[PDB]
Design a binder for this molecule. Sequence first.
Ligand code: FAD
Ligand code: FAD
Ligand code: E92
Ligand code: E92
Lengths: 495, 500
Amino acid sequence: SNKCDVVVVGGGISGMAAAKLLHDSGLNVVVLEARDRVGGRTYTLRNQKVKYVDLGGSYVGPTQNRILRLAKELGLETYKVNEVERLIHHVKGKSYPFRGPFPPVWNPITYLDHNNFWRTMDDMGREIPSDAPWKAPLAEEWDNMTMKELLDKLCWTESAKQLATLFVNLCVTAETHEVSALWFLWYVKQCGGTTRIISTTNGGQERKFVGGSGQVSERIMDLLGDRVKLERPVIYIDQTRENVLVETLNHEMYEAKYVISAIPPTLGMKIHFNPPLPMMRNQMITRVPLGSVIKCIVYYKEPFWRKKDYCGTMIIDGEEAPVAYTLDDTKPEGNYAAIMGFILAHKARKLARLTKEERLKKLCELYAKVLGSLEALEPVHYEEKNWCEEQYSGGCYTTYFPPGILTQYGRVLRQPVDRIYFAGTETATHWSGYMEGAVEAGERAAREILHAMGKIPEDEIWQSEPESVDVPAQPITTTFLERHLPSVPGLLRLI
Amino acid sequence: SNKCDVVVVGGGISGMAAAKLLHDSGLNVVVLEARDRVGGRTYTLRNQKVKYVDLGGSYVGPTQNRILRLAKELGLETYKVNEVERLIHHVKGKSYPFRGPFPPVWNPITYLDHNNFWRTMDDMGREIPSDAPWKAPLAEEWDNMTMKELLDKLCWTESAKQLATLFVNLCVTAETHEVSALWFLWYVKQCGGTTRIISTTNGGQERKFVGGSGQVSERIMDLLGDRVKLERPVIYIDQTRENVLVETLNHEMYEAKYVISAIPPTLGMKIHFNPPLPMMRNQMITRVPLGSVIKCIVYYKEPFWRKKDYCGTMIIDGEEAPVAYTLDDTKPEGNYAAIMGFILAHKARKLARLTKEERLKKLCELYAKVLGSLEALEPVHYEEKNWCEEQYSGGCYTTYFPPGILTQYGRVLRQPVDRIYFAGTETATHWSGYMEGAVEAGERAAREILHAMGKIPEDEIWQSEPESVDVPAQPITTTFLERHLPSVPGLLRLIGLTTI
Ligand SMILES: *Cc1cc2c(cc1C)nc1c(=O)[nH]c(=O)nc-1n2C[C@H](O)[C@H](O)[C@H](O)COP(=O)(O)OP(=O)(O)OC[C@H]1O[C@@H](n2cnc3c(N)ncnc32)[C@H](O)[C@@H]1O
Ligand SMILES: *Cc1cc2c(cc1C)nc1c(=O)[nH]c(=O)nc-1n2C[C@H](O)[C@H](O)[C@H](O)COP(=O)(O)OP(=O)(O)OC[C@H]1O[C@@H](n2cnc3c(N)ncnc32)[C@H](O)[C@@H]1O
Ligand SMILES: O=C(Nc1cccc(Cl)c1)c1coc2ccccc2c1=O
Ligand SMILES: O=C(Nc1cccc(Cl)c1)c1coc2ccccc2c1=O
């Protein structure tokens, strides 16, 4: 066998960040990656037509200080996603341009309902500990309800319910009826709340990496050299002996003191364990699916939308639209003009049956309608990736928790199993689901091992992160009226 | 590589039934079984204290003609579970003995609510095709709510809601908020409806096999000889070449024309596929967990409950009770007196923290109160099995579907993937979740392959089963009043219309 200090299973950002930390501390690490590439749910494609394009995870923003620091160390730079001009909300067949992060409404009743919806998401979040959502005071009540049930209760207008539904679909690539309310509320809260998670300027979608996010994993692979083994899917982990034994599908055996599992939780099912996993993890990893998304990028000769004072962001309500959300994917120089759109949740399943060319046509026709421009019908290039197809991801962006699961099994996610510690963005406590969470979790799991080895104290397992100088966070603010305007039923109680 | 016609992955009842059918048709079959035993979610323990005991699947009954026929052919016999004396419904700390399958109520409003609850489960079920539940007219609406939501809408009394909750917990070893309403309604309907699924006499729990259900898989192994390979967990299936290659964990390669996957759907995740699975199956197998149950058998010197005119059946509502349901597990000879109980759904997780001895004590204390009998505190022996611990089962009894999954992914459950065909009880259309469904699916999958090989016509893939002459099925009937008594809101509507 091939002997080392730590085997890291998975060469996504999380596994790479863990391996780098352990390597930098002087341990001999091996990364076993199932695919013929690193990066996992990040994947940057290069060709002459696009130069580069992120087909997986791409955006970073303020408060994501760990991914920003790691990337900066590896020599990467960011640029801002274009949000100079107006955003579009397309509702009942018409485009309504706006500025600011939240799509506005004019009807007084609908205004109260929208205001109350967003406010309530954050109010509920304040009672959910980031590191232990199952300790929320109403954890059981909220976990035993889907987001569809919660929205049906909260939203007195169809307007609010449709936007709230889009919000859920876009955040977690899942239907409102598929996901626990507790989990979804936790998910938003642990990204810093509604404003932070939905915002381009001053939020999660503010920036992209120049040259693609795949460079994070690639450049850590560059550092580690032949310590990264590609096309080594892990099939078997044996902890019965002195050293942990890790076997791959291509018949290699690795021997280590400890293991980091840096794969999506459910993909633990692809590994046969000796001894068997404890009951709760055994069942947990069958209860935690990933979402469904096709990421689609349509290229144009110019960013023609900008001429009409549109930035390229479209929020598109309703069943008919294949894509509910877009961002300008143009490169910082104004070249490789492009619109990125997501085909979300059930639509990813439905539209997957079409050809690439058929999806292109549907997207272009949608964009022509929403941007009010025939230029949208003249694409120069198209790239897409359906993440539902991936054996070694299970979906994207991340794992969702159906009703009842987080309270019953949530504690299990990062609980060590003998000498196996658990990384992966799903185990993070801040921006779980994102590249930021991947770094947090990888580095925390690495430091758990350093602590197990007696190399650092307990209090250094979790480490704060200085704020990025390049991408500082501005405060999230609310107005007096936003804080104090009644809900619809609140207004009815007064009458 | 070890060459054959068909590799069957999994040596449970379904895989063994498939392998037997293929073997009997003259093909060369291999069964690759992960464990050191066959039977899977069936497991018959033998020792001197119990003689034999089913720790997994046990009960068979009328309308389950495939398992009955298979078992009979293998030389097995059944006996009736004891239901001579009164059943007990224990509610709010008190026991109420009764007869008939449904726990009764006296309060007229509660009576209407209970009657409407069961009726409505079956009314909704009649809308749902057994072979295509996603084709129900309101499939999407029903699949997008949990059973909790449905019961909250349907049950106008807490009495009905509590019993309905126990019904779901006991039927599918999952919480009402965990499971799709469409899927649960399908599940009940495809067992023949509420009466059939809940009944001992004339239903699913009528009988057990003399000597244990494990004998079904064991006796098929005896017929197959060395074709069954134990401690061969399958890790890899490669369909890129002319013949399918199937690799095991212990470093063996098998080569076949076709493969039958006879494992729980989610346990397909334990196999690496080349080429990758199609998208819909890739995601489906991460969305279909199994339920949670500890099966617990407490042994006594005598079946003392019978002397108080209790048959041993206890239906126990609420949170505090560790066990919500019991049956008499005494041998047909009248010895090895025993009570079988299930610890269900979240309680299987909660009470797994305890020792075996602590669980025995809590069960005995519960039974002593429910039976009003100090003798329940004097057990002579105890056996149990927590199926949540099993790497190669994932849980018991079966796979449940959370909201939204059956409509989006249900159609690919038994869709072949090139030369892989899908057996397992989960793919059955009649008594899916049960030993019966395991037989149906194994035999159907086997015949799919026979058809692919040009050995039988397409109309022979699905085959009806003659009714058992030993376990005849009484029809499910309703009374006029059961059919036409109003629901609680129906009564309220009548009240508003009268006074107008
Ligand atoms: C897919 C996606 C993701 C995404 C998103 C849009 C799409 C379409 N947008 C994002 C965004 O704009 N900003 C952001 O910060 N995140 C976004 N996401 C999510 C993001 O990509 C993920 O959160 C992150 O990449 C997850 O990283 P992590 O390291 O936790 O996980 P991973 O990338 O899945 O890596 C796991 C690796 O393990 C390998 N693997 C799997 N099984 C095995 C076995 N058995 N043996 C060995 N290796 C295994 C995988 O191949 C993978 O490389
Ligand atoms: C567990 C349980 C089940 C049960 C029940 C009570 C409990 C506690 N009560 C039942 C009852 O009274 N009556 C009844 O008819 N059914 C009852 N159930 C359900 C019943 O046991 C199951 O429906 C049935 O046994 C399932 O049969 P099936 O053949 O479909 O599935 P299986 O038994 O799980 O067999 C699968 C086999 O495959 C092996 N395996 C798993 N993974 C692999 C890999 N990778 N490679 C090779 N083999 C694999 C398993 O080890 C198993 O043997
Ligand atoms: O909720 C979001 N944006 C948003 C932006 C405007 C309106 C509404 Cl309702 C939602 C976002 C949620 O998570 C994401 C994850 C990856 C990429 C983009 C987003 C996103 O824009
Ligand atoms: O629903 C059931 N029984 C029942 C019996 C009486 C009252 C009520 Cl509410 C329920 C049962 C359903 O599925 C089963 C599966 C394996 C073993 C027993 C049962 C069962 O008794």
